[PDB]
Amino acid sequence: SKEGILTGSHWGAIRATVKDGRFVAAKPFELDKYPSKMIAGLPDHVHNAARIRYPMVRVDWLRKRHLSDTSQRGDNRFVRVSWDEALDMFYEELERVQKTHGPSALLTASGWQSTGMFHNASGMLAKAIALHGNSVGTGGDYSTGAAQVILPRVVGSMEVYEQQTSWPLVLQNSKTIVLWGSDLLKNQQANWWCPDHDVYEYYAQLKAKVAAGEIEVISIDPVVTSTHEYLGREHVKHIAVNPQTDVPLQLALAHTLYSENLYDKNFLANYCVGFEQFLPYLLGEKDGQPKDAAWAEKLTGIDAETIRGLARQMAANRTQIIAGWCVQRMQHGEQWAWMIVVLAAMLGQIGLPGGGFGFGWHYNGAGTPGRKGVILSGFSGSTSIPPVHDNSDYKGYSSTIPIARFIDAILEPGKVINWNGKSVKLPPLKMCIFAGTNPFHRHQQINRIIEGLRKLETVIAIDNQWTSTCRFADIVLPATTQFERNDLDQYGNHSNRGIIAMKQVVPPQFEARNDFDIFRELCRRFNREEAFTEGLDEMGWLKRIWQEGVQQGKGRGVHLPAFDDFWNNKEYVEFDHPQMFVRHQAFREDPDLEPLGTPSGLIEIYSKTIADMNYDDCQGHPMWFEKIERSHGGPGSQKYPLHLQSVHPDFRLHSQLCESETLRQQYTVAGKEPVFINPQDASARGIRNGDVVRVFNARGQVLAGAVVSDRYAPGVARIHEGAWYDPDKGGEPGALCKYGNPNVLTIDIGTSQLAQATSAHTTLVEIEKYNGTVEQVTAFNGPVEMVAQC
Ligand SMILES: NC1=NC(=O)C2=N[C@H]3C(S)=C(S)[C@@H](COP(=O)(O)OP(=O)(O)OC[C@H]4O[C@@H](n5cnc6c(=O)[nH]c(N)nc65)[C@H](O)[C@@H]4O)O[C@H]3NC2=N1
Ligand SMILES: NC1=NC(=O)C2=N[C@H]3C(S)=C(S)[C@@H](COP(=O)(O)OP(=O)(O)OC[C@H]4O[C@@H](n5cnc6c(=O)[nH]c(N)nc65)[C@H](O)[C@@H]4O)O[C@H]3NC2=N1
Ligand SMILES: [Mo+6]
């Protein structure tokens, strides 16, 4: 049939080939010099056994609805129903919950979904429900849950998703680059809008500068990252810090900087507040313990003199701090993010090209010069009319909670917690809807999630693959992939390089529907179809989005062609006039005219506002707090001696494309997710490559396939997140996961009272070669379909 069909995804733009109605090969877009291997999984993603073929309802839920046996969730026994029957039940449940409980019982949830301006699954969900009634909202996300709360308070920006100093300037000016828990090479494969991958050009240049010894790269990381491996182990200075001891390391660098007069007094005095209130802590005047190189050597396992050497090197020349997000996705994650800023402040290079800090470097091609282009605005969740049932009665519970507290809300309703200076009362949720997110991938401590779901009346999942979420649902609705629809997207993110047409590759498979059509038909049930669609279909909406784009471009001085011209004749437009950027430079150059958005206008090393909250676990300046569990001598490490990283996958985006055999064949071990193990740790357990091992703690147990790797320091392991949950006894708490989802082993706790964010990477485990029976993996084969024989 058809060859060279242009479209896009989180993993990049493709030229798709179709043969006899099947998507068979995905070639890289011709402008993409650095495509991701993951595009090879996209045909499988469209055509594999886990694709949701039709609406499905959990046997006993179909029988008894909200009066059903919730214990059977997870058993994977579902009945096919018609679309109209499914949508009716959906509507009737919305009606029932609104009448019985009101808006405090209802939660929606969304996530990374797919690229595409119109086919915005989160927007479809939010709009449809918002046209029916009120619900519990959430604040924050799992990416930068801690950082995005603390950083506004201390540097007046969210920071984490923002543009970074242009790489050309970094490469011409920085002499030391500090990668602090950041894997650029691995994580720039997938971006929010279709990636252009042009940032990899800069990484190649960096590689050459490293080889020539012009730039020294320091990696502060328990593991040799993909980036480190790429730049070269012979060249990269590796600080293999003990997991979760980064704050001690930060404080000791700060101490050294002060102790040896390497700090910038002028910068601290003129661009910051509160340094004087922090120093007594740092120096041990108010506790007897200097937060010094000697002190930190005990915690971090880094030689004190190496700590001092690091500080001195950072101060000695132009130094770029590149901070990732993983180190704030753990207990008290705000502390580490805050100390990145403090350390950068003490160095005094903030606002210089290739100096200072940033958190956005691994995301959205950050550091690529931004072009003078157009950014389209997609289908919004926003409504202009009130809900049909506009009940404001949340019965004395809060109407917004932190995103990661939703299970705590189900299990501990009425619990009162602090959140970033406010008081929150967790509502008794009864009905959850998921569209474009996978909770059994995303959230922590799956056995507790199981217990939480068992208190729910109704669970609805809408997806294009039969995920672990779908396995634990009551109603499952088949959404399409983006490859079965038409759309528009940005090409490039921070670069704003271009815009691409997403042309339909194949027709909707089976009776899968675009989320637009799902929620449109739902809205018809309560007479709000028109308010949802705004009188437009797919191609109408795409034309509307483009035209708004055309209007934005005129008056910004960028000319776009007409829609039909673009769609049918061009398919791709590219922008020009790339701009250099230096982050924080405006503030550095004129702090009076360009103040930070902080209480003082300055960098808050001490925050009176935070101090006044009276949170013992997030005080007025950064502090070392001991963790609920930590490796290398921390709590629990006598029982569970290994730190388990749940790092972002190299061969998927989260749980997406786990079902691809094309990709799995490249990294699976014994048919399972690989677990990475240090050679000394492996030899102590008699473990070797290919072994089926049990990774366990007091929270859960999983099976995985051992990879013995010297990239891992002793006492550090990894199972990449996104490995699907596959319980041996479906639905039972304490089931052994046969594929190896790390969130079976994580703990579900708030970072601190400030952010109340996910602490996913605060995880201790043991590993042993497994002595039980290895059953077949059942993760990727859909449900057990059930039929009425009567
Ligand atoms: N390929 C790919 N897959 C994805 O799933 C993906 N997801 C995207 C999203 S949504 C996000 S949030 C980002 C992920 O952003 P994030 O920064 O979380 O990335 P990771 O690669 O998981 O972790 C970065 C590094 O932290 C290190 N690290 C772990 N624990 C510690 C510790 O205690 N101390 C120190 N110093 N380092 C530590 C890890 O070893 C790793 O090299 O990537 C984005 N890009 C993505 N690309
Ligand atoms: N242990 C642990 N460590 C971690 O580092 C960690 N990181 C966290 C982070 S940073 C993030 S971003 C979250 C990610 O959590 P998130 O839930 O966002 O992850 P995905 O696996 O991308 O799930 C998206 C789902 O939407 C579906 N989908 C895609 N397109 C569509 C569409 O058009 N319509 C519909 N209806 N569905 C669609 C996909 O099939 C997929 O199942 O995981 C978090 N969880 C984490 N846990
Ligand atoms: Mo994220």
Author numbering: 49 to 838
Task: Please give the exact wording used by the authors of the publication that reports this structure.
The TMAO reductase TorA is a monomeric, bis-molybdopterin guanine dinucleotide (bis-MGD) cofactor-containing enzyme that belongs to the dimethyl sulfoxide reductase family of molybdoenzymes. TMAO reduction involves a membrane-associated pentahemic c-type cytochrome TorC and a molybdenum-containing periplasmic enzyme TorA as a terminal reductase. TorA belongs to the DMSO reductase family of molybdoenzymes and can reduce only TMAO, unlike R. capsulatus DorA, the DMSO reductase in this bacterium which reduces both N- and S-oxides. TorC is required for anaerobic growth in the presence of TMAO; it shuttles electrons from the menaquinone pool to TorA in the periplasm.
We solved the X-ray structure of E. coli TorA and performed chemical crosslinking of TorA and TorC. Having established the conditions for the formation of a stable TorC-TorA complex, we set up crystallization trials with TorA-TorC and TorA alone to analyze the molecular basis for electron transfer. The two chains present in the asymmetric unit were oriented toward each other such that one molecule (chain A) covered the entrance to the other molecule’s (chain B) active site. Both active sites had clear electron density for the Mo ion coordinated by bis-MGD and serine 191 (1.7 Å from Mo), but no obvious density for a sulfido ligand. The sulfido-containing bis-MGD is highly sensitive to oxygen and may have been damaged during the long time required for crystallization (>1 month). While the solvent-accessible active site (chain A) had a malate moiety at 2.8–2.9 Å from Ser191(OH) and at 3.5–3.9 Å from Mo (distance from carboxyl group to Ser and Mo), the covered active site (chain B) had a water molecule at 2.6 Å from Mo and at 2.2 Å from Ser191(OH). We could not discard a partially occupied sulfido ligand at this position. The first 50 and last 10 residues of TorA were modeled with low confidence values, indicating high flexibility. This was supported by the crystal structure in which these residues were not defined in the electron density. We therefore replaced the generated TorA model by the TorA crystal structure for further analysis of the TorA-TorC complex.
